[PDB]
């Protein structure tokens, strides 16, 4: 139908916008601490601690499958990356501090995205 095409056009444009957000967010992680899933060969008991792992690569996979229906779903996954890290790692680690910095700096990008999503429909 024409409506389904229109809808898919909107989703495609959302995906274009979220891909830009994702690249902007990943820039704020230059050490690339959050680029890939935490390795179970490197952290065998990770899943005993963290029940919903997340990372930038996994987000990108869902993104390209147009699996984010709105900005809120995308933000949920971003928050998972940060919150998982701030629980698994102690306050005085380079990991915890990297999450804090990624959180604080990412806030600007996400503030704009919320307004762009709202204004452009
Ligand atoms: C994202 C996150 O929490 N981490 C990623 C890096 N990491 C390891 C990497 C290599 N070996 C052991 C651990 C644990 C902490």
């Amino acid at each position: 139908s024409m409506e389904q095409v229109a809808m898919e056009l909107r989703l495609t444009e959302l995906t274009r916008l979220l891909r830009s957000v994702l690249d902007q967010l990943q820039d704020k992680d230059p050490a690339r601490i959050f680029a890939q899933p935490v390795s179970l060969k490197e952290v065998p008991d990770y899943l005993d601690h963290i029940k919903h792992p997340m990372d930038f690569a996994t987000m990108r996979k869902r993104l390209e499958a147009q699996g984010y229906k709105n900005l809120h779903e995308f933000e949920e996954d971003f928050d998972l990356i940060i919150d998982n890290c701030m629980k698994y790692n102690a306050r005085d680690t380079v990991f915890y501090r990297a999450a804090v910095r990624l959180r604080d700096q990412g806030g600007v990008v996400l503030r704009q995205a919320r307004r762009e999503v709202d204004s452009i429909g």
Side-chain angles (χ1 to χ4, degrees), residues 1-6 8 11-15 17-40 42-60 62-68 70-110 112-119 121:
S1 76
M2 269 177 75
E3 186 37 43
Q4 286 285 18
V5 162
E8 291 159 346
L11 180 52
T12 292
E13 270 336 285
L14 176 59
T15 304
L17 184 151
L18 294 181
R19 194 182 293 113
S20 178
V21 179
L22 183 58
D23 299 343
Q24 282 179 80
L25 293 177
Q26 198 150 14
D27 282 349
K28 280 18 166 166
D29 174 33
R32 290 195 76 84
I33 295 164
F34 306 109
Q36 298 294 323
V38 170
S39 175
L40 298 164
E42 288 183 5
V43 188
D45 77 338
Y46 187 67
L47 301 189
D48 295 340
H49 294 267
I50 295 307
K51 293 300 167 171
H52 297 102
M54 193 43 60
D55 64 272
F56 281 137
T58 302
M59 291 189 66
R60 193 170 298 276
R62 177 170 170 185
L63 175 64
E64 291 305 327
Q66 298 189 338
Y68 293 115
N70 53 61
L71 177 60
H72 180 65
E73 295 189 331
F74 182 94
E75 286 189 280
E76 274 193 326
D77 270 353
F78 178 64
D79 288 342
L80 267 181
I81 293 177
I82 304 302
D83 298 338
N84 289 348
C85 186
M86 296 180 58
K87 289 169 191 65
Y88 187 81
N89 300 285
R91 197 147 60 243
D92 69 330
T93 64
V94 60
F95 307 109
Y96 183 109
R97 288 164 179 283
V100 162
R101 286 168 62 82
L102 178 57
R103 182 191 64 186
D104 295 345
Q105 298 194 243
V108 192
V109 177
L110 299 177
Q112 250 324 114
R114 170 49 64 201
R115 298 192 62 89
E116 284 187 303
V117 161
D118 285 352
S119 98

